[PDB]
Amino acid sequence: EACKFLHQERMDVCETHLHWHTVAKETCSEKSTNLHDYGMLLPCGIDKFRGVEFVCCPL
């Protein structure tokens, strides 16, 4: 098994870095992996974003 690169965004709300970090971490954990690294997508407002891409690696 290698690491998996994933992209998740949404179109209904803008959210902070903390939210997107949480999403990335929890998505990796749902897939039986650990988050290694991530980057937000689609900056919005003064301090928010509309998604995250991220790399989940084997436990």
36 is in an annotated binding site: no
- Reported structure resolution in angstroms: 0.9
44 is in an annotated binding site: no
Listed by start position, the domains of the chain span 1-59
Spatial contact of 7 and 40, defined as CB atoms under 8 Å apart: no
38 is in an annotated binding site: yes
Spatial contact of 48 and 12, defined as CB atoms under 8 Å apart: no
Method by which this entry was solved: X-ray
28 is in an annotated binding site: no
What lies within 8 Å, CB to CB, of 43 at 6+ separation is 49, 50
Return the number of other C-beta atoms located less than 10 Å from residue 17's C-beta. Answer: 13
Write the burial class of residue 27 (CB in 10 Å: 0-12 exposed, 13-18 middle, 19+ buried): middle
Q: DSSP string spanning 16-58?
A: -HHHHHHHHHHHHHHTTEEEEEEEEEEEETTTEEEEEEEEEEE
56 is in an annotated binding site: yes
Task: Please name the fold of domain 1-59.
Answer: Dna Ligase; domain 1 (3.30.1490)
Spatial contact of 6 and 54, defined as CB atoms under 8 Å apart: yes
